[PDB]
Design a protein around this motif. Structure first.
Motif, PDB file in Angstrom:
ATOM      1  N   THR A  91       0.819  -1.202   0.000  1.00 40.05           N
ATOM      2  CA  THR A  91       0.000   0.000   0.000  1.00 40.05           C
ATOM      3  C   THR A  91       0.857   1.258   0.000  1.00 40.05           C
ATOM      4  O   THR A  91       1.692   1.447   0.877  1.00 40.05           O
ATOM      5  N   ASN A  92       0.644   2.107  -1.004  1.00 38.27           N
ATOM      6  CA  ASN A  92       1.264   3.426  -1.000  1.00 38.27           C
ATOM      7  C   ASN A  92       0.346   4.429  -1.666  1.00 38.27           C
ATOM      8  O   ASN A  92      -0.544   4.064  -2.421  1.00 38.27           O
ATOM      9  N   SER A  93       0.571   5.700  -1.358  1.00 43.95           N
ATOM     10  CA  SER A  93      -0.309   6.766  -1.828  1.00 43.95           C
ATOM     11  C   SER A  93      -0.272   6.951  -3.340  1.00 43.95           C
ATOM     12  O   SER A  93      -1.286   7.283  -3.946  1.00 43.95           O
ATOM     13  N   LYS A  96      -2.544   4.370  -4.656  1.00 49.70           N
ATOM     14  CA  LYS A  96      -3.902   4.678  -4.229  1.00 49.70           C
ATOM     15  C   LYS A  96      -4.546   5.757  -5.106  1.00 49.70           C
ATOM     16  O   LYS A  96      -5.756   5.803  -5.255  1.00 49.70           O
ATOM     17  N   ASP A 100      -7.609   0.917  -6.309  1.00 51.64           N
ATOM     18  CA  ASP A 100      -8.038   0.606  -4.957  1.00 51.64           C
ATOM     19  C   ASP A 100      -7.272  -0.609  -4.436  1.00 51.64           C
ATOM     20  O   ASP A 100      -6.648  -1.354  -5.197  1.00 51.64           O
ATOM     21  N   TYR A 101      -7.332  -0.792  -3.120  1.00 45.03           N
ATOM     22  CA  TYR A 101      -6.787  -1.961  -2.460  1.00 45.03           C
ATOM     23  C   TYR A 101      -7.906  -2.722  -1.792  1.00 45.03           C
ATOM     24  O   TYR A 101      -8.901  -2.144  -1.330  1.00 45.03           O
ATOM     25  N   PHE A 103      -9.087  -5.255   1.423  1.00 48.70           N
ATOM     26  CA  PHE A 103      -8.731  -5.418   2.823  1.00 48.70           C
ATOM     27  C   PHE A 103      -7.341  -6.037   2.904  1.00 48.70           C
ATOM     28  O   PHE A 103      -7.010  -6.913   2.112  1.00 48.70           O
ATOM     29  N   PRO A 104      -6.480  -5.541   3.812  1.00 51.33           N
ATOM     30  CA  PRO A 104      -5.116  -6.065   3.838  1.00 51.33           C
ATOM     31  C   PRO A 104      -5.002  -7.458   4.444  1.00 51.33           C
ATOM     32  O   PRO A 104      -5.851  -7.839   5.265  1.00 51.33           O
ATOM     33  N   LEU A 146       8.300   4.563  -2.007  1.00 48.54           N
ATOM     34  CA  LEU A 146       8.197   5.159  -0.673  1.00 48.54           C
ATOM     35  C   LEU A 146       9.355   6.073  -0.383  1.00 48.54           C
ATOM     36  O   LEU A 146       9.173   7.160   0.153  1.00 48.54           O
ATOM     37  N   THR A 149       9.042   9.360  -2.348  1.00 49.43           N
ATOM     38  CA  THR A 149       7.956  10.264  -1.965  1.00 49.43           C
ATOM     39  C   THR A 149       8.065  10.709  -0.493  1.00 49.43           C
ATOM     40  O   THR A 149       7.283  11.553  -0.043  1.00 49.43           O
ATOM     41  N   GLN A 207       8.839   2.934   8.047  1.00 48.54           N
ATOM     42  CA  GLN A 207       7.593   2.979   7.274  1.00 48.54           C
ATOM     43  C   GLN A 207       6.741   1.759   7.624  1.00 48.54           C
ATOM     44  O   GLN A 207       7.233   0.630   7.687  1.00 48.54           O
ATOM     45  N   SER A 208       5.468   1.987   7.880  1.00 50.47           N
ATOM     46  CA  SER A 208       4.547   0.896   8.152  1.00 50.47           C
ATOM     47  C   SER A 208       3.572   0.881   6.999  1.00 50.47           C
ATOM     48  O   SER A 208       3.033   1.915   6.642  1.00 50.47           O
ATOM     49  N   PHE A 209       3.384  -0.276   6.368  1.00 50.15           N
ATOM     50  CA  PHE A 209       2.370  -0.396   5.329  1.00 50.15           C
ATOM     51  C   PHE A 209       1.769  -1.794   5.356  1.00 50.15           C
ATOM     52  O   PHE A 209       2.036  -2.572   6.282  1.00 50.15           O
ATOM     53  N   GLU A 210       0.916  -2.080   4.383  1.00 55.41           N
ATOM     54  CA  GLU A 210       0.220  -3.353   4.319  1.00 55.41           C
ATOM     55  C   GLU A 210       0.488  -4.014   2.995  1.00 55.41           C
ATOM     56  O   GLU A 210       0.788  -3.340   2.011  1.00 55.41           O
TER      57      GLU A 210
ATOM     58  N   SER B 230      -8.085   7.287   1.188  1.00 51.57           N
ATOM     59  CA  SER B 230      -6.857   7.884   0.668  1.00 51.57           C
ATOM     60  C   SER B 230      -6.153   8.706   1.724  1.00 51.57           C
ATOM     61  O   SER B 230      -4.939   8.645   1.882  1.00 51.57           O
ATOM     62  N   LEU B 233      -4.600   6.547   4.508  1.00 52.51           N
ATOM     63  CA  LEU B 233      -3.374   5.927   4.010  1.00 52.51           C
ATOM     64  C   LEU B 233      -2.237   6.935   4.042  1.00 52.51           C
ATOM     65  O   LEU B 233      -1.142   6.610   4.476  1.00 52.51           O
ATOM     66  N   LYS B 234      -2.500   8.167   3.603  1.00 57.83           N
ATOM     67  CA  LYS B 234      -1.466   9.195   3.629  1.00 57.83           C
ATOM     68  C   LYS B 234      -1.024   9.474   5.068  1.00 57.83           C
ATOM     69  O   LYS B 234       0.164   9.604   5.331  1.00 57.83           O
ATOM     70  N   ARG B 236      -0.898   7.390   7.494  1.00 58.34           N
ATOM     71  CA  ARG B 236      -0.035   6.305   7.926  1.00 58.34           C
ATOM     72  C   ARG B 236       1.346   6.427   7.272  1.00 58.34           C
ATOM     73  O   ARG B 236       2.372   6.293   7.936  1.00 58.34           O
ATOM     74  N   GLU B 237       1.364   6.661   5.961  1.00 53.57           N
ATOM     75  CA  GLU B 237       2.599   6.707   5.187  1.00 53.57           C
ATOM     76  C   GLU B 237       3.496   7.862   5.642  1.00 53.57           C
ATOM     77  O   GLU B 237       4.720   7.731   5.677  1.00 53.57           O
TER      78      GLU B 237
END
Ligand SMILES: [Mg+2]
Lengths: 247, 255
Positions: A91-93, A96, A100-101, A103-104, A146, A149, A207-210, B230, B233-234, B236-237
């Motif tokens: 998952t990253n902006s 996004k 769409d994503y 559910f993780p 990541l 950005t 960085q925390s993501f899914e 959105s 998510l931002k 969190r990122e």
């Protein structure tokens, strides 16, 4: 909603999420791994048939800021060559903004590793102030995005001044060659480097993501996929699959 | 698609649940009565997306569960279904029962079920041991996520735990009962970590189990889900969620 439907699923090899056999198999049976087991169960419960479609460019996908075009599995989805991306899709902006994503299914972080005990490096940005070690990220993969950005543009420097790596095999080869910090994702590195006893972490994970599946905006299938993935997590199926597949 | 949040007035479901939300009961009016991690998220969302808002608490002061006798919801979940609110802005745990009725935003935090115990002498290693003894009493809070997870667990001994445990009204009542001793309280990791930081005589029962998320709740077909997702998510990122947890969650320990 999916009973009788056929789903074209974007994927690539990324052990232990997906393994792709290049010979000795046909069709869906060329695929195995944690994500394949998820797809098989989804297909049984929801009643769809499926096939896997790899991007010709063999990339996960990133947005090129010069051309404003995507590549990889993201691009195939946007081009309507696939209905869903079934892989460890971070998952990253940037993504996004285009897709769409679901559910993780798993948490993940960025991890940096290096060969050789006793590295003097404490944090990856320290790489910019020395020349003993080289370093790199793989092009068109999430960690590159990541870092590019990140608010702190020193992370863009790390990417821009690093060695570009083609894929996971190239990166691990380079890592094993020594004097090289490879920056990628914790779960992928945890598997894949389990037997490299002389490879060590640089700094802590950041960085925390899914990991999730990718869906086109307005997909008619998102609700059902999300519900069933949540149930997989709640029932302990995801944990069982990780135990099965991760070394 | 065309609908965004600019100029909209959102009604947000919430209740006090420290450190996510604190609700002042006097000396304040309207949104100024609220503070906490979730409030800070909502403020930032409102500024960036251009909506105004208010918070609406359920009269029953419950989070929300499905009654299998009546097939009706309660709590914040019911208020959302009944169009009293547009979004549930709290630490709303993800579970399949809720997902059948509502949607979730992109998650903001991982969480697990945690059991804690107060008592000298023999202790317990895993919650199901409670069923084969009578030294310790135990409980979960009604109409909250842990009760739902235990009742829907495919091992029905977890339903026994719920059915044979003491009824707990809310978090204050549960913590009161725990502090009274010889009691196992089964709830959520982050909530317990914050609220029991000073309780040096409270210990764990086994490891955390069941993994789930905290997210916001949204009605199915909400025109606002994409934007909220959105923006979360931002957050969190960009590290905003971590900064807010560090701001609001309790630190140190007299213990
Ligand atoms: Mg998570």
């Amino acid at each position: 909603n999916l009973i009788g439907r056929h789903l074209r699923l974007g994927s690539v090899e990324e052990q232990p999420f997906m393994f792709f056999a290049t010979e000795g198999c046909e069709g869906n049976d060329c695929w195995s791994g944690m994500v394949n087991d998820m797809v098989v169960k989804l297909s049984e419960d929801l009643g769809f048939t499926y096939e896997y479609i790899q991007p010709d460019d063999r990339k996960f996908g990133a947005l090129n800021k010069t051309t404003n075009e995507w590549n990889g599995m993201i691009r195939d989805l946007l081009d309507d060559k696939t209905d869903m991306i079934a892989i460890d899709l971070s998952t990253n902006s940037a993504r996004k903004s285009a897709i769409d994503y679901s559910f993780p299914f798993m948490d993940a972080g960025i991890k940096a590793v290096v060969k050789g005990e006793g590295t003097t490096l404490n944090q990856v940005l320290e790489l910019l102030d020395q020349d003993k070690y080289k370093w790199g990220v793989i092009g068109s993969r999430h960690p590159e995005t990541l870092l590019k950005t990140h608010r702190d543009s020193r992370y863009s420097r790390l990417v821009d001044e690093g060695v570009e790596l083609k894929d996971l095999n190239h990166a691990i080869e380079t890592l094993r060659g020594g004097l090289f910090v490879f920056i990628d994702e914790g779960p992928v590195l945890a598997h894949n480097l389990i037997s490299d006893c002389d490879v060590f972490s640089v700094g802590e994970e950041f960085q925390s993501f899914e990991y999730a599946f990718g869906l086109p905006k307005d997909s008619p299938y998102k609700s059902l996929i999300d519900s069933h993935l949540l149930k997989f997590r709640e029932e302990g199926f995801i944990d069982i699959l990780w135990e099965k597949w991760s070394s």
